[PDB]
Paper text:
AARSs play an essential role in protein synthesis by charging tRNAs with their cognate amino acids.
These data, together with the conservation of important active-site residues, suggest that CmLeuRS preserves posttransfer editing activity. The posttransfer editing substrate analogues Nva2AA and Ile2AA can be unambiguously placed at the editing site of CmLeuRS. As was observed for bacterial and fungal LeuRSs, the aliphatic part of the amino acid binds into the hydrophobic pocket formed by residues T292 and V426, while the amino group interacts with the universally conserved aspartic acid (D433); the adenine base is accommodated by residues of the GTG loop (I414, S415, V423, and K418). In our structures, a water molecule is well positioned for promoting hydrolysis (3 to 4 Å to the carbon alpha atom) and is coordinated by a eukaryote-specific lysine (K496). A similarly placed water molecule is important for bacterial LeuRS editing complexes, although this is coordinated by a bacterium-specific aspartic acid (D344 in the Thermus thermophilus LeuRS). The interactions of the catalytic water and K496 at the editing site of CmLeuRS are strikingly similar to the situation in the ThrRS-Ser3AA complex, which suggests that K496 could have a similar role in hydrolysis by eukaryotic LeuRS. Compared to the structure of the CmLeuRS-AN6426-AMP complex, the posttransfer analogues retain 3 to 4 extra water molecules (depending on the monomer chain) and a phosphate (CmLeuRS-Ile2AA complex), which mediate polar interactions between the compounds and protein residues.
Author numbering:
A (entry chain A): 254 to 367, 377 to 541
B (entry chain D): 254 to 318, 323 to 541
Write the structure that this text describes.
Amino acid sequence: GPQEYTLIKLKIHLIPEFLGSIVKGREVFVVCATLRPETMYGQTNCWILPDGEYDLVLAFDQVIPYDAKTSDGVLCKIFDKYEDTMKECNTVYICSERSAYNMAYQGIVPLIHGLPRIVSLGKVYGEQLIGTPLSAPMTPYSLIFILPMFSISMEKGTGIVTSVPSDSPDDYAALRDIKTKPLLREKYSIKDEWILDPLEIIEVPGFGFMTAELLCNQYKIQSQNDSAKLKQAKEEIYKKEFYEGILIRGKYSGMKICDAKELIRESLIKDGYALIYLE
Amino acid sequence: GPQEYTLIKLKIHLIPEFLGSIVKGREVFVVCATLRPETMYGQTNCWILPDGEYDLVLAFDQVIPTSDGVLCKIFDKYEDTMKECNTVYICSERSAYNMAYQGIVPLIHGREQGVSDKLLPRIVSLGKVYGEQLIGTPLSAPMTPYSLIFILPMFSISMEKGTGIVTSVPSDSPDDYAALRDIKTKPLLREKYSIKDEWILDPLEIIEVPGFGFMTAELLCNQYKIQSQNDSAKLKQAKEEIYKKEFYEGILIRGKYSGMKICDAKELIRESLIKDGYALIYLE
Ligand SMILES: CCC[C@H](N)C(=O)N[C@@H]1[C@H](O)[C@@H](CO)O[C@H]1n1cnc2c(N)ncnc21
Ligand SMILES: CCC[C@H](N)C(=O)N[C@@H]1[C@H](O)[C@@H](CO)O[C@H]1n1cnc2c(N)ncnc21
Ligand SMILES: [K+]
């Protein structure tokens, strides 16, 4: 059965020149599926697969919100032609085609009678979005950048992911690879100013405030591509932090993750910074 | 743009035996797309393609009676459908998807099979049947005075159009007249599909057309030298003359709007069929 994600919306702060005519002064969001909305205080950057192909998809300005935990289905919405969508759709999401169809079949983006089709304004490689500044929710850094991550799967989520390197071993590893490998930075023209240090957001009694760093050392993870080791560190950190982790930032500071998580998810959804996304 | 049909509901009077367990506890309808709801007073039979494959499709009991978008519920599981759906429609799979995408039949959460795990909604099909196996099914059809009409074979049906199942008003459709005549004049065709004489009902006088009278379809078939339901070029012309002529000059002589011009009564008849639950608005 489907997994419930929180779809995090990250607004593009400066549209790249080459996308200007295509987005026609609509708001553009990069969207990222996460199981851990409580960690959004720690965002340092955003991650994209360089060779991955993403769509710029037309989306609803408003989505009908629902109690997914006490309901028997979900609604979608189909139009005759593109021009009919324009009253309700002035928002663009960057995401994989795969995920855009999943979104269409739960009322996040429109379908049209084109077998029904999404409204794709164009395609882009992730490489072409590297260095794009994004306005991000909750993180006190506020403005963060898109960086390359090579371990991403285009078959999961949107193909674009948040980075919380304090409390995700994958994120820690990927960031450390960027910080320690000049040739990688040279290859993708990564500017020094795009790289932000981890933030102390979660206290784990025993481990302190950089649990992901300690777990990377405990499993001797050397790169973002040590998948076997990273898979284990990821599952341990999730269990370790869901029970023992105390938030030390934001409205629910001093609470445990298990107690605050749902409240944070609600808040994100009511403020418009995130959506419920099932795939 | 898409054209606005009226989807007519023909209630199955007695379910064919082989489908009885499948549709137990549910009202079953054959559904037919028509541009001519005003002619349902003259229904003599129903038409199906023998080789065609039709689905038994679970349907909403209630539907939402511009150029906005149209909502659609995708249900988590088959089971959830059950409470707002005790209705089955017989129709082509193609037409059922069209119906699903305008809120007429439920969709259910599904996935692309084998390689992919991507969300792909499905109609709730209860079974696939050939048209041949429904020949002779008795139907309770709206507006016609015939208490029962029957499903008969027609060979000129296109499976891409409407539901693949069509109404028969042989007094005012040249196609219907020609197909019915083929059955009435070919014993070997009746033997081939085991057609009983009591399934073959006569045209009903329903519309008076200046210069033609009450059997305009027969007179057009004579005029265009139509001898067979397969005379597609002649039939298409005849159909194009009869549509305009009847809309603006044809006078209804049956129903509540007897005495009125078709152009003045058609929408009122269509509203009434919809309110009474005998039909739905169907775009394709
Ligand atoms: C802990 C906060 C920061 C962290 N980065 C996070 O939220 N990761 C996503 C999520 O928490 C996890 C679920 O398995 O996988 C990640 N994920 C989602 N989509 C993908 C994808 N397409 N490819 C690889 N990983 C993914
Ligand atoms: C005058 C009433 C009786 C008349 N018989 C009627 O209602 N015909 C349908 C409709 O009015 C017409 C639209 O062109 O095609 C017919 N039609 C609908 N579906 C199909 C199909 N699948 N194949 C061939 N014709 C079709
Ligand atoms: K009747």
